[PDB]
Amino acid sequence: APPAVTISASYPGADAKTVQDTVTQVIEQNMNGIDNLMYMSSNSDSTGTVQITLTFESGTDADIAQVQVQNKLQLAMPLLPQEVQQQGVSVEKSSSSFLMVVGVINTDGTMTQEDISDYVAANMKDAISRTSGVGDVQLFGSQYAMRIWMNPNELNKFQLTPVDVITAIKAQNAQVAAGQLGGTPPVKGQQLNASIIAQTRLTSTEEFGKILLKVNQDGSRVLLRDVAKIELGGENYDIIAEFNGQPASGLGIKLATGANALDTAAAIRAELAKMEPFFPSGLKIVYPYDTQGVFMTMVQLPAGATQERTQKVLNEVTHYYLTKEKNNVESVFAVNGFGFAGRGQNTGIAFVSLKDWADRPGEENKVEAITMRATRAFSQIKDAMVFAFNLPAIVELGTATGFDFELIDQAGLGHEKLTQARNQLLAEAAKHPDMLTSVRPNGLEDTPQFKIDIDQEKAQALGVSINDINTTLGAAWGGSYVNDFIDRGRVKKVYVMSEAKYRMLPDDIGDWYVRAADGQMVPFSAFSSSRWEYGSPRLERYNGLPSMEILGQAAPGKSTGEAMELMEQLASKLPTGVGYDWTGMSY
Template sequence: MARVELGGESYDMTTRLNGHPAAGVGVMLAPGANALATATLVKNKVEEYRHSMPEGYEVAYALDSTDFIKISVEDVVITLIEAIALVVVVMYLFLQNIRATLIPALAVPVVLLGTFGVLALCGYTINTLTLFAMVLAIGLLVDDAIVVVENVERIMHDEGLPAREATEKSMKEISGALVAIALVLSAVFLPMAFFAGSTGVIYRQFSITIIAAMTFSVVVALTLTPALCGMLLRPTSPHRKGFFGGFNRFYAATERQYRHKVVSTLRRPLIMVSLYAAMGVVLFVMFTRLPGSFLPTEDQGSIMLQATLPAGATASRTEAVNQQIVDWFLTEEKQNIDVVFTINGFNFSGAAQNAGMAFIKLKNWDQRPGSENSAEAIAGRATYALASIRDAQIFALTPPSVPGLGQNNGFTYELLASGGTTREQLGNLRDQLLQSAAQSPELLGVRANILPQTPQLQVDIDTSKAVALGLQLDDVTDTLTSAWGGAYINDFIDRGRVKRVYVQGDGQYRSSPSDLDKWYIRNSEGTMTPFSAFASTRWTMGPESLNRYNGSASYEIQGQNAEGFSSGDAMNTIERLANELPAGTTGAWSGLSLQEKQAGGQSTTLYAISILVVFLCLAALYESWSVPFSVPVSGAARRAGYRAGGGTARIKQRYLLPGGVADHGRTHLQKRDTDHRICGGCGFVGEVR
């Protein structure tokens, strides 16, 4: 009746590691789980089983995203320490007093400790976003303490007051400015916490971290710093010798030249107004023209290759192509490669015999120095070299910036059918779009993420004949499925493990279309009826799968931006090319591209709100509608610097820009306001002299 044997549940896919047979196990994080903690638990469990494995078996990690997380956190921690050290050195260079330098330096650990408390209260972790926010905040949080120390020292020097009285007078003068900077910076960074979608999830921690640090900085500047000033500061001589004397003379000469330039400019108000207007125009142009992107592409220590063979290619041909990929990496990129893990029968386009995939784990970053050994550079060389394999179309890809949002870096565009467009017509329009994209200098590697149509054997059942022969249609389909495709029956216990039982026709009875005639079905009268009595077969071409997006027939178009262009440029180009197609299609974005589009739409509104609130805070502080207009001028220079450096306007940069501008502008305006009160309203031109 049957042959019973133990075998694999499925033979659709096979895997190899560095060319050797392997069994791959993927581990995905549950919602809310910590990647580093999960990876540690998994590796500990694997080590427990390693000793009980049969001889000749080894365990290797073909892909481990936590390596990149660890190195990223370590780099940011080092940067944080360096930032603190540099801030202390710069403070000592200008304050030139150990006691005065110690006061702002003591504010740093206090503020960081309070910020960590807020993060713990919010349920956040120490990650690259929160640490980066602290790196940025280091320079800002000591600024408040420096303002207090400098003003106290000025009063002690100019008015001869002791430290305690000088501190009391100083706090009466500058407390308003300290509170103002907290309000201004909160207005700049708070909108980031209200971003919707993935952008909000990504940058909410950054926003809350920097706002918490700024708030604690002001609290420390209003409480701890004045107390330390009253206890530690002593009168010092303004005359310095040696290195500090030379530095002070150089700085004084530079300051005199600067004041002279300012006076000359103020005596020509028309020129000043014209320059201000020009800077405003430059700021607007740079804001609108600077290429946009969502997140930077980083070297995550791994790359991926997707191979697609012609329709109808067998599994053995796919395995041969994957072996060529392995051989190339282990030969040409041996110094950069740790592990090559290949999959036969699957890639991001779908599961089929003609689909192949490779995951390449690179060596540690310090073992492959130089930009020529980065993941992106290796992927570029692989794409160029493996294009010589005529049996397959091969693309080398880098992992997405945010795991789970898309399959790889680059854009993902959905070409949708509309207005009664058939799938065949949509396929023709897809080909037109790909041809246009191949000629565009902004785009690279544009492709349809779908497997080619393959030969398919279609079984046509004459239902009228089947019913006339006394057959039930359910019996027909069940027999066809079980005999040719296999059917799950039940479970059994094998050496303490539950395994499944499948029934399927033997290979010799389902190896060709004519074998269908060898199968019979019992009718209602108990007579065996052959399939040939009511069914026929024919060969057709068809897709492995049919994609739909929001209920519409679709084709997913993937690609990257060419060198010298941003992801925003590439997305605008593919949209323009899609709009030039004949009527019958619409478009949509998915993955990281969708998040970039949504973030771009939100950022303009939130950016405008930030600027408005900053302006109102400064206007209220200085009781003037005109004074705050001087704050955003430096934004034009910063924006132009991004453009000149080949940078792009990412979400993070858009909000760091007004934060830095507002902070420095506030400092200059507070200095001007304080000097104005001291000289009794002598006028700004008189002050700068």
């Protein structure tokens, strides 16, 4: 168990390259002078997420390793975009795998998946996060935010833009420090002393709905609800979970580095016991994954696959366990949008809990046989990688046979040329079945992306500021974190974003207007042009340089050192500037 510290940052609405070039690189360039550091890797996703992993040598104090990593991170923090700092950069020291999953359902069916996720995030997640031994808590869902779903037709009707919406929310959802009557130093003999209370954070959709955007010259008022729909909704809509086919949320808990697995698991159940008596009616905790009796099912669809497509594969996976294996499987906790390879619309995971060992007699009813049958039954699912496995079992087999390969861009060749060098290496490895078996990339392939060019001259000629253009585009199509509000006594976020139907098709770009200096409304089509291109949804980096991870195993009987030997020989014939290194078990 090599100790690993993880940096995590979020950039709402950012593509993979934007995350890498404004966040990841700035942080990586300061990740030096850290003691006992073996290697560093990172992923920059088009989900607006970056995860930098720093692996240390065995015996390294995880406390000291975390302190030194964060000490270097502080050098980059003031260089990061404000939108990233406001989300809250995190530095954690935990195992990569989950110690347990705490499921939450509503046996009355009176709470939706969105409601259950908000209750878990607002009433349960923090106390679990603060418990000793808990290194990382993954919420299977999202906390409620105040969602302002903008309508571009109505915004243009009143000569308003998302910039005006953002401005009005900051001004009318405010917490004002207003001082005191008779505060010190007072006029001597002052009797009255009281705090002045001015504006306070809004607490309801009703209050956000009556935010005054403008007063027309004829006297009529334009309220926020006149250009937007107001409702409580998740900060993001990327993670949706199910428990035996019914709506659910939950917490994925990873063990802190070096902590006791049984002591931490006991403290988690004790903290859950304090929350249960105050649950709303119907809510109940379930335990679908404890750490054989359990296994996981990985679900990976090709990059660009929508959430609907991923749910259909998870349904087939869940259906298999609930029908074919109902005599062995006790519960299935399936999560759409979150997987082994981080987060994305393209990924999912299922946690399967079996019945008691005594109630599963026979060798064909043990974890190894069940996962083997499930994988073969899932092998027919096309354009989707689905495998079931007990995590202890594949780690044991991977160390004995598998290798972990890093293809590195060592000459500024760029992502496109590194892809070619990867395909040349994968094709050559496909001509040696006697030594290499299933040599594949671990990452994602390029996908079509919408490249829009802002014409600087037309923008200046019309008097439209670039900040207004970028804010309107980014807030509408990506969502913007404006400020905070108070939801039932708890601080939560306020998000501005276009309603779904106005941000679906490329023609909808032209329906968004920006107000110029002279007060004229200008559509986006007047100062922009667009075209289709390809780009990466996940950019990888190894020790600060662009990289692509490649996995594989040695041929039957051949040693790992023999497979690593051939991989080095094939890599030696790659184009100039392309290097390599061994990581993970191969290190």
